[PDB]
Structure 1
Amino acid sequence: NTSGSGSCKGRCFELQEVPPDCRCDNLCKSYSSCCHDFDELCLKTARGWECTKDRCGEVRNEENACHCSEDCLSRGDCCTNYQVVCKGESHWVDDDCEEIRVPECPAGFVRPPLIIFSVDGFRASYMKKGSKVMPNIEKLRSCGTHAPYMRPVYPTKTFPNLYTLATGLYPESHGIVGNSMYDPVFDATFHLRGREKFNHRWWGGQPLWITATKQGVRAGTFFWSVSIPHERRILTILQWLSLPDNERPSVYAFYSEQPDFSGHKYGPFGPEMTNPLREIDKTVGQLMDGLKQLKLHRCVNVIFVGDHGMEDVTCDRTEFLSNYLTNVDDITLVPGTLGRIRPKIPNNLKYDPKAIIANLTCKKPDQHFKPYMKQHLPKRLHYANNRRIEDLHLLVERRWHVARKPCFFQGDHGFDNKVNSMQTVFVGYGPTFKYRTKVPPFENIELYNVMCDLLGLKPAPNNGTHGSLNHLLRTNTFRPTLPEEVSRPNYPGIMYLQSDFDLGCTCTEERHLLYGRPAVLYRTSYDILYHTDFESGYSEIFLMPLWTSYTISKQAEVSSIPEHLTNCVRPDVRVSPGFSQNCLAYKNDKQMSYGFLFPPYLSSSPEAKYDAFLVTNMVPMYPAFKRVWTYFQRVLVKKYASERNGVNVISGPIFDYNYNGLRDIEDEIKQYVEGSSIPVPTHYYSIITSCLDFTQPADKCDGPLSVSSFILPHRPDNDESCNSSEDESKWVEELMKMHTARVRDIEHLTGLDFYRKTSRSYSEILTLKTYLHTYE
């Protein structure tokens, strides 16, 4: 027919591409193009997967799944336990750890092979079960390189996280934004069940196997048809490692759907969680026993990685949109541990997203979801820049579900990736990995760079920070390089006259720039301005500081903005009026007010406070945002300075009007103060750095640093905070925790490079820039 039927004799699980002729590969069943003898020749199950005493030295029966004869080592098809049963050897788990300082690979191996062992729904807390349940896995964790947990990407669903690992891209970037999704361009829907998921048009970016392929590294067939058992896949990977030098792949992948399947049906803390965990460990033991049989246990690099965790979710904790909305039949909702709303039909003139958002906003005192326009989602989630992401998004609180209209499950996932239950596992074992080393938790977007390094691959452009995980590897082939500055700063003097201004208003480096001047990595003209208490880089294009740096010691006296100085704004004689803002625009804008990047409340002396009221320290701020900002400046900064023995703060604006996580150009800026060229930031950031050894002051730190950061949305109302009518001590801190950010996120949104002049390696700094303070 279209395929036909030849013989799979000597072709079982071939890697060669073969369609005119009949196939014998891992996915031949999936296309119904196998040969008549494929099942009988390749999918053998007779007598199981383990050797026994009776089978030692047996006469070779080809019917058996694996063999226990003397020849099986030469012919390459013993069972994984042949040597321990029939030759008195030991399981790999029973052997003590021995540090693999150099790869002990057979001749013909140019590089250590990489085997990626991925598991679905593996909570990091499962490793607390330890050697009791998973001895093989614990040995990999103990004698290898391991993190306490690895942060997944949002949403914490299976395929978005699996592909993020393969690409190093955020789901908005590689295109798999959920297990269920609708692409308006395709007019088609992607689902966990169906053929549309196999269409490659959905899968963007460059996955690892393509990156290896385009650079001459042989990738084994990673993906298996469902009907092939796990044990057969393990024996096949071992057989591939025994292939001749001109065919042996360098990178291998094993994926297991457990313990995710059981976790959904039993709950993450269920007593029969143990059985799937043991079964996974037994599969790992078969791999390690087999690698030891092939003398590859001290040659291969093994990665044990998960995609997400699992949380207690039952139908008794389900929110229904029908208790909020009157048009549930006019909408389409992606349900579950997350919510995405869409009109059921286009041309429905009775569909208003504004009315839907309002009717979902703080309508119940314990409302277990929060509506969001995707552009207002916390920037750490990086979930806006895709046509497959609906404008209306619902962030569901942990342990809860959202449906459209009113259990067989006790567990589910998909929540905010900072939720502790969604954290998953990472283990690195092999010659290139470190021995008995614990590394701090990291995000799964960084693994693509490491896997490329472990294969000598040049990474495709991705959202990992290359070099941020060099501390995982005994041998690092990537040396990070500081980006070069593009725009150098003007250091202007006192060059203008206060009479030359038509403002319309009325009325250091050793201490405040502790980690070096941020580098402007884009072409602009900006001025570095010095003051007693703060230093800034003032942009002449955007009429405000790009960054503002100041240090607050543990011993600091808070002050109030004086009543006479409340509305004081002063011209800066170092900046021209044409490159300055004006207070008339703020008066002529009914909705926009102004704030100050360096807080006047924290001025050192009454004379120094006059600098805090300079026009060059002024930024546009909604009255709603000013409530958040003023509490942060008047209360929170000193509190942080008291807890952390002083803090250095870098604050400034962020413009991202197309919600792509990147720095806006002037053309992409779409709002300005009324009758003015002053741009309105979409967000405001701050970077709060101190000495990790808090017995040292922030301005006199010797070793590693500690950082916390946020990116607050700049919004005209506080509808995000349901308790905003109360005092700021009751809601402001909670809002800031939800919008915590890595310094790296700020760098993308500002085009600035931080921590350039410090006393640690660039690799250590890159790890600091990727840190996310979770408060969880």
Structure 2
Amino acid sequence: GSCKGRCFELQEVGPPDCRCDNLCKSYSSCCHDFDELCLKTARGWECTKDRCGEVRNEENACHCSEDCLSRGDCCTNYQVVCKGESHWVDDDCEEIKVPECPAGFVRPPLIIFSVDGFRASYMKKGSKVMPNIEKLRSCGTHAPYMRPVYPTKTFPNLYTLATGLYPESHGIVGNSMYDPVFDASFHLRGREKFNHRWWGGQPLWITATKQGVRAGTFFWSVSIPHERRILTILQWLSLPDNERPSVYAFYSEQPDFSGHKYGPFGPEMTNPLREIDKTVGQLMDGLKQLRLHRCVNVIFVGDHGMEDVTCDRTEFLSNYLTNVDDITLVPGTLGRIRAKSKYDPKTIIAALTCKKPDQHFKPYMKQHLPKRLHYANNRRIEDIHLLVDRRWHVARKPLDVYKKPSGKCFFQGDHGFDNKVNSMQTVFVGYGPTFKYRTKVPPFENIELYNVMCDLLGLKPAPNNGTHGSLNHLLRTNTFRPTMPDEVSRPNYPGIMYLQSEFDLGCTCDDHTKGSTKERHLLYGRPAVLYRTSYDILYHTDFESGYSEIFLMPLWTSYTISKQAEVSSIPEHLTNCVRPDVRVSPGFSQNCLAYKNDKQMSYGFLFPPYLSSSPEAKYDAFLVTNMVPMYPAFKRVWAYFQRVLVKKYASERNGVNVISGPIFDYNYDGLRDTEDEIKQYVEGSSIPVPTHYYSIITSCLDFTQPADKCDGPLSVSSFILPHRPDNDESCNSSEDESKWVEELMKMHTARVRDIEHLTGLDFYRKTSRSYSEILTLKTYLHTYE
């Protein structure tokens, strides 16, 4: 019945014997003497000079007596105050070229210092506010920011950090959730959240344990002071070889807790930032005191940022919907709606769509949300979602909300918004023997981190949504080397096979061998096809394509548009021209009759006829092998992109290479559909309708070089446009395309990697860059923020 000998014991005792572990307070299951022995606070956490060589008083939180080292309970500043040593922060950066660990240590430990709601811009505050953190940042490896997953809430982001998985895959899709299979709710408060049934994937503490690497308890009851959390970690580090964990985590509820009260830029935020830094100093001083300060890898990382949000900036569904009492809303910086058991999704979406001039939320069916959010493929995600404007909340009705009785809001800051929003970005710093010295790295998504942490511990990662190798540039030593996948399907290269006469495709028109087309239009090699299919490489003066005889359209179409390229028209005489392709059987070709019989569907072209190099070349653009099903509403988007925006990008970027193609993701799992999974065809045909259209736009990062003569790193932007039969998503869509199309595109920006998942292709296979560098490029997201 005693915690004597057991404080913060790693092997938690089962029921009903009392506990002394990190979480016993949250189970109200601590032994009676837990507070007394394990949560001592007398005299604080710092030695003072008058305590140096004191007689030991056992009531003290930490000790300054001469036996403190042998007892394992000196204050973190003991050697500094009592033995004349410097604080860690007062030492200059010193490159740790090799881990310097005690005997017995078989790998450098990892300590994750996680800070809740640590907005990326808080790093600008500087060495006068946060001297310790700024030393970590400038001596170690750091990114300008780290992007969280959506929703930009704590539990989804903490578990992503831990698993490398999107929320829809790990299952923690919100701080609040309903699961229809369990018929149960998950809430930050209450004990439900501890039940293993909610938690999917394989978190780092499980990965370590499964591979024979011990973890400290990552979780801490709120009542355990931060200083005690640190002392506990440090004390665990002095355990014998056969007990000592290799992986630890500190967690702090700051600066999030204050951020909500004062807003992210409230002047009161300086105090929490100072206190966090002091906690960091206690860790580093502690490690130095243990002579582990050149042994341990330390990651400083946040879960998300913080935005200015006040109760007066609240949209109410009751202003849009009658009978708002039929609905359940998960409210705040996002919306999820479901019925209470009158309810009808289409009525609800319509009634919420483009209804007020300044409307600060947009409704979506989850499958129509931007693919970059990867927020749909989980039964815990409601079909109806509201994306809320930064700085705003959505609520169901006024009386569902309440101010203080004094009339002021409960909060001035909040988070949860789209993870592209600047204010939601958080931090990453790595410091120690395995990280690079005084190195800055590009920003990266938090899904990538699990793989790094695995590498840092010599663990094989569980299957996750990180691209393993994409952050090899963070480390001075890599335990993992990325290898480029082998191509599964080889292309055919058909010459002239058929004759005009053999084609009865219902089309009308008013009437190539590699060469240097491959050199000019495919700058980074052919994409590889990573699934079993039959497809043809088709060459033309102005573009190259990979044409699928299964889906009867290109998988990809590649072409290069120079800065000085001329945009021309679709001649009147070629307005409705479609031409048979003599290289492809009639049987594996689309036909024009299908389109005439389909009253909703038209067609467009992947290579734009607007960017033809000559009148003769333009005829290639009307080949049946270049056409794709497009709703008329979609053609408004695509024609504007092709006729106006491609030239613009080319003009701005000193030329661009473009790869465009269809995506099919009818089951919204972010993966390429099998043919069995396609649920819509051009009527009377087996022409599959794309759910989306992608484009990858590449150029030289050094803009002084043209895109087709680039020596160094590359620059990419990409999108995955939803193929919709209306433009209800774009509230200004009844105006000229100049007012809304490019904003639609920006909303549906994507990583090359997202397109790879969605198509089963592999891009950038032949460049003068290292594969690791290419992995970084493929994980880049252009945000426009």
Q: Post-superposition shift, 1:107?
A: 1.2
Give CA deviations for 1:105-133 in whole Å, capped at 9, x if unaligned: 11111111000000011111111101121
Q: Post-superposition shift, 1:23?
A: 2.7
- Counterparts of residues 112-511 of structure 1 (less than 5 Å): 112-344=108-340, 350-406=342-398, 408-507=410-509, 508-511=517-520
Q: Post-superposition shift, 1:226?
A: 2.2
Contact 2:114 2:250 (8 Å CA) reproduced: yes
Q: Distance in 2 between matches of 1:631 and 1:389?
A: 34
Q: Distance in 2 between matches of 1:404 and 1:27?
A: 35
Secondary structure at the counterpart of residue 572 of structure 2: coil
Q: Post-superposition shift, 1:163?
A: 0.4
Segment of structure 1 superposing worse, 627-636 or 84-93: 84-93
TM-score under structure 2 length normalisation: 0.97
C-alpha distance 32-312 of structure 1, shift in aligned 2 (>3 A): closer
Q: Post-superposition shift, 1:359?
A: 0.5
Q: Can you give the 5+ residue segments of structure 1 that lack an aligned partner in the other structure?
A: 1-5, 345-349
Q: Distance in 1 between matches of 2:30 and 2:717?
A: 56
Residue of structure 1 aligned with 2:644, choices 607, 612, 635: 635
Q: Post-superposition shift, 1:55?
A: 1.1
Q: Distance in 2 between matches of 1:317 and 1:36?
A: 47
Q: Distance in 2 between matches of 1:26 and 1:340?
A: 34
Aligned to 2:72: 76
Q: Distance in 1 between matches of 2:470 and 2:748?
A: 22
Contact 2:175 2:188 (8 Å CA) reproduced: yes
Give CA deviations for 1:433-475 in whole Å, capped at 9, x if unaligned: 0110000000000000000000000000000000000000011
Give CA deviations for 1:227-279 in whole Å, capped at 9, x if unaligned: 22111111111110000000000000000001101111101110101011011
Secondary structure at the counterpart of residue 343 of structure 2: coil
Aligned to 1:12: 7
Q: Distance in 2 between matches of 1:38 and 1:714?
A: 60
Q: Post-superposition shift, 1:493?
A: 1.1
Give CA deviations for 1:508-540 in whole Å, capped at 9, x if unaligned: 001101100100000000000000100000000
Contact 2:527 2:761 (8 Å CA) reproduced: yes
Contact 2:606 2:660 (8 Å CA) reproduced: yes
Secondary structure at the counterpart of residue 325 of structure 1: coil
Q: Post-superposition shift, 1:82?
A: 0.9
Q: Distance in 1 between matches of 2:259 and 2:41?
A: 28
Pair 1:683 & 2:679 matched: no
Give CA deviations for 1:574-597 in whole Å, capped at 9, x if unaligned: 000100000000000000000000
Segment of structure 1 superposing worse, 49-58 or 635-644: 49-58
Q: Distance in 1 between matches of 2:49 and 2:579?
A: 91
Contact 2:150 2:375 (8 Å CA) reproduced: yes
Segment of structure 1 superposing worse, 118-127 or 6-15: 6-15
Q: Post-superposition shift, 1:481?
A: 0.5
Give CA deviations for 1:346-391 in whole Å, capped at 9, x if unaligned: xxxx211000100101001111000101000000000010001110
Q: Distance in 1 between matches of 2:476 and 2:546?
A: 40
Give CA deviations for 1:293-317 in whole Å, capped at 9, x if unaligned: 1001111000000010000000111
Q: Post-superposition shift, 1:181?
A: 1.0
Q: Distance in 2 between matches of 1:17 and 1:370?
A: 47
Secondary structure at the counterpart of residue 126 of structure 1: helix
Q: Distance in 1 between matches of 2:32 and 2:783?
A: 56
State percent identity of aligned pairs: 98
Q: Post-superposition shift, 1:74?
A: 1.6
Contact 2:537 2:545 (8 Å CA) reproduced: yes
Segment of structure 1 superposing worse, 60-69 or 740-749: 60-69
Q: Post-superposition shift, 1:34?
A: 2.9
Q: Distance in 1 between matches of 2:28 and 2:627?
A: 67
Segment of structure 1 superposing worse, 82-91 or 24-33: 24-33
Secondary structure at the counterpart of residue 90 of structure 1: coil
Q: Post-superposition shift, 1:564?
A: 1.0
Q: Post-superposition shift, 1:28?
A: 2.5
Q: Post-superposition shift, 1:38?
A: 2.4
Q: Distance in 1 between matches of 2:374 and 2:132?
A: 36
Give CA deviations for 1:730-768 in whole Å, capped at 9, x if unaligned: 111100000000000000000000000110000000000
Q: Distance in 1 between matches of 2:173 and 2:524?
A: 37
Contact 2:695 2:719 (8 Å CA) reproduced: yes
Q: Post-superposition shift, 1:77?
A: 0.5
Q: Post-superposition shift, 1:37?
A: 2.5
Q: Distance in 2 between matches of 1:35 and 1:267?
A: 39
Q: Distance in 1 between matches of 2:411 and 2:147?
A: 24
Q: Distance in 2 between matches of 1:670 and 1:517?
A: 29
Q: Distance in 2 between matches of 1:20 and 1:257?
A: 30
Secondary structure at the counterpart of residue 132 of structure 1: coil
Contact 2:12 2:20 (8 Å CA) reproduced: no
Give CA deviations for 1:579-634 in whole Å, capped at 9, x if unaligned: 00000000000000000000011110111111110000010000000000000000
Contact 2:333 2:417 (8 Å CA) reproduced: yes
Contact 2:47 2:78 (8 Å CA) reproduced: yes
Q: Distance in 1 between matches of 2:364 and 2:219?
A: 37
Q: Distance in 2 between matches of 1:162 and 1:701?
A: 40
Q: Can you give the 5+ residue segments of structure 2 that lack an aligned partner in the other structure?
A: 399-409, 510-516
Q: Post-superposition shift, 1:20?
A: 5.4
Q: Post-superposition shift, 1:24?
A: 2.1
Contact 2:220 2:251 (8 Å CA) reproduced: no
Q: Distance in 1 between matches of 2:737 and 2:6?
A: 70
TM-score under structure 1 length normalisation: 0.98
Give CA deviations for 1:50-102 in whole Å, capped at 9, x if unaligned: 11122111111211111101111122100011111111111111111111111
Q: Distance in 1 between matches of 2:421 and 2:703?
A: 27
Segment of structure 1 superposing worse, 513-522 or 178-187: 178-187
Contact 2:309 2:393 (8 Å CA) reproduced: yes
Q: Post-superposition shift, 1:14?
A: 1.6
Secondary structure at the counterpart of residue 282 of structure 1: helix
* Aligned residue pairs, count: 765
Give CA deviations for 1:125-172 in whole Å, capped at 9, x if unaligned: 111101121111000001000000000000001110010000000000
